[PDB]
Each structure stands twice: as structure tokens, then as C-alpha cells.
Scaffold this motif. Structure first.
Motif, PDB file in Angstrom:
ATOM      1  N   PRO A   1      39.247  12.866  25.800  1.00  0.00           N
ATOM      2  CA  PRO A   1      40.174  12.541  24.721  1.00  0.00           C
ATOM      3  C   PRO A   1      41.513  11.935  25.158  1.00  0.00           C
ATOM      4  O   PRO A   1      42.267  11.440  24.317  1.00  0.00           O
ATOM      5  CB  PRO A   1      40.385  13.902  24.033  1.00  0.00           C
TER       6      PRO A   1
ATOM      7  N   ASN B   1      39.604   8.318  24.916  1.00  0.00           N
ATOM      8  CA  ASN B   1      39.854   7.990  23.522  1.00  0.00           C
ATOM      9  C   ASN B   1      41.322   8.179  23.184  1.00  0.00           C
ATOM     10  O   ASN B   1      41.719   9.152  22.547  1.00  0.00           O
ATOM     11  CB  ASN B   1      38.939   8.814  22.588  1.00  0.00           C
ATOM     12  N   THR B   2      42.132   7.202  23.572  1.00  0.00           N
ATOM     13  CA  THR B   2      43.581   7.375  23.474  1.00  0.00           C
ATOM     14  C   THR B   2      44.159   6.965  22.117  1.00  0.00           C
ATOM     15  O   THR B   2      45.380   6.978  21.952  1.00  0.00           O
ATOM     16  CB  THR B   2      44.300   6.580  24.572  1.00  0.00           C
TER      17      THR B   2
HETATM   18 MG    MG Z   1      42.294  11.319  22.023  1.00  0.00          MG
END
Ligand code: MG
Ligand code: CL
Ligand code: MG
Length: 225
Positions: free
Chosen positions: A211, A192-193
Motif C-alpha cells: 500500500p 499503491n500510493t
Molecule cells: Mg496506499
């Protein structure tokens, strides 16, 4: 039995290998704002993977109650590209080199799977990650009829690699990308960039959620067990 079976790691490009998404989001947000249209920075991340034509059309339908013409699409996409290119060149995503190096040392073959036809970034794959990839083991817009979220790009990667789905893992950042990996029947890891809620990536079909690329790299050994 992941260590035994895995042969290849299928990396998405934008938001996984290159930190390009803040620039794509800003360019989309700003081009729309100059035309009086509301596409938030966050919403631009939701549409990652869609054609420029589809993104423009989604906004036109919601805000102006009609579809865009071909000349509206061509102009707005041109302006988006102008803005994106006016920003600094997207650097490698932190963690991307490290994870590539790690998987390579484990005897796995990195591949790139993108719906992008953006030559400025595509050509930079060789420049920025020399020795990591081979053009015969890459899927780009030039290889596919339908992009993400259709599974076509990932199924094409399996075909180009001579791989079965259980011999690969997908690394994706975007909900449409995660959907494509999942619909191709491949174990899909979401990184989840961006600014989206991680739940959007889980809802899209992610098998695991991390993450950032560096946190994935740090956890890679415990995935492989
Ligand atoms: Mg992230
Ligand atoms: Cl915003
Ligand atoms: Mg991406």
C-alpha cells in the motif's frame, strides 16, 4: 533465488520517488473543469503514463464526441503545466529514500524508469537523491519512442544496465506502469500510493502489491528470502 540473482531495482519516478501525483491529478482535473470537461481526480491517476495528447483526446472523445486539435492539446497541456508548477514543489515520497538506502546497502543498483520528459522533476532526481542514481542508468522520455504501457522503457533499462530480466525488479505505482514492467518480463511490485483500488494494479500484472513505499521498505527483507 532473488538475493542471488538481483542486481538492480528499477524505480518509476512519479508516485514512487516523488509524491507528485496529487499535483498532476489536481492540475489535470482542474484544467478540464475550467473547460467544462469532466476528468475526475481518480481518472487522472488511471491515465498516469499516457502522453498529454492521448489523455486530452480520451476526454474529448468521451465528452464532446470528437478528437482534440493540435492547438487544443497544446493549450490545455500548457495550462495543466502552469497549474502544476503553481502548486508546491513535489516532495520525495515518504519511504523512497529509506528503500533506496536499503537496496543500496544490499549491493543493488537503483535505476529510474520514467516516460516523463518533465525537466523540473528530472533535474530534481540528482538534487533530491544525491549519490543514488547515474544518468547512464536512467530511462526518460528522451530515450524512448513509446512510453508506458508499452514495455519499451523497461526493456531499455535492461539494455542500459546490461541486465537480464531476472536480474531486476520494477517498483511502480500506476496501472499503465505496472503493465509496462510486466510486459517487459520483469518481476513487478506495485505500490499503491494513490486513490485507486489495488485490484487495478493486480489486473495490470503486478507480482506483489503493497500500500505504500514505506510498507514495501519494511517488507523488503521478507521478499528477498
Ligand atoms: Mg496506499
Ligand atoms: Cl474528483
Ligand atoms: Mg508513476
Amino acid at each position: 533465488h532473488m538475493r542471488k540473482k538481483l542486481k538492480a531495482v528499477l524505480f518509476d519516478m512519479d508516485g514512487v520517488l516523488f509524491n507528485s501525483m496529487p499535483y498532476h491529478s489536481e492540475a489535470w482535473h482542474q484544467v478540464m473543469k475550467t473547460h467544462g470537461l469532466d476528468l475526475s481526480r481518480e481518472e487522472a491517476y488511471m491515465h498516469e503514463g499516457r502522453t498529454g495528447a492521448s489523455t486530452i483526446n480520451i476526454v474529448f472523445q468521451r465528452e464532446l464526441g470528437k478528437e482534440a486539435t493540435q492547438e487544443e492539446i497544446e493549450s490545455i497541456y500548457h495550462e495543466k503545466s502552469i497549474l502544476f508548477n503553481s502548486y508546491p514543489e513535489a516532495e520525495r515520497m515518504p519511504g523512497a529514500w529509506e528503500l533506496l538506502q536499503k537496496v543500496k546497502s544490499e549491493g543493488l543498483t537503483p535505476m529510474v524508469v520514467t516516460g516523463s520528459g518533465q525537466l523540473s522533476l528530472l533535474e530534481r532526481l540528482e538534487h533530491n537523491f544525491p549519490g543514488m542514481f547515474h544518468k547512464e542508468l536512467m530511462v526518460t522520455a528522451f530515450d524512448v519512442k513509446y512510453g508506458k504501457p508499452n514495455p519499451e522503457p523497461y526493456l531499455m533499462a535492461l539494455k542500459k544496465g546490461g541486465l537480464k530480466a531476472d536480474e531486476a525488479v520494477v517498483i511502480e505505482n500506476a496501472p499503465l506502469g505496472v503493465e509496462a514492467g510486466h510486459k517487459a518480463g520483469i518481476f513487478t511490485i506495485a505500490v499503491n500510493t494513490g486513490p485507486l483500488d489495488g485490484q487495478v494494479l493486480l489486473d495490470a500484472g503486478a507480482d506483489l502489491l503493497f500500500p505504500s513505499m514505506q510498507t514495501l521498505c519494511d517488507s523488503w527483507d521478507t521478499i528477498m528470502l
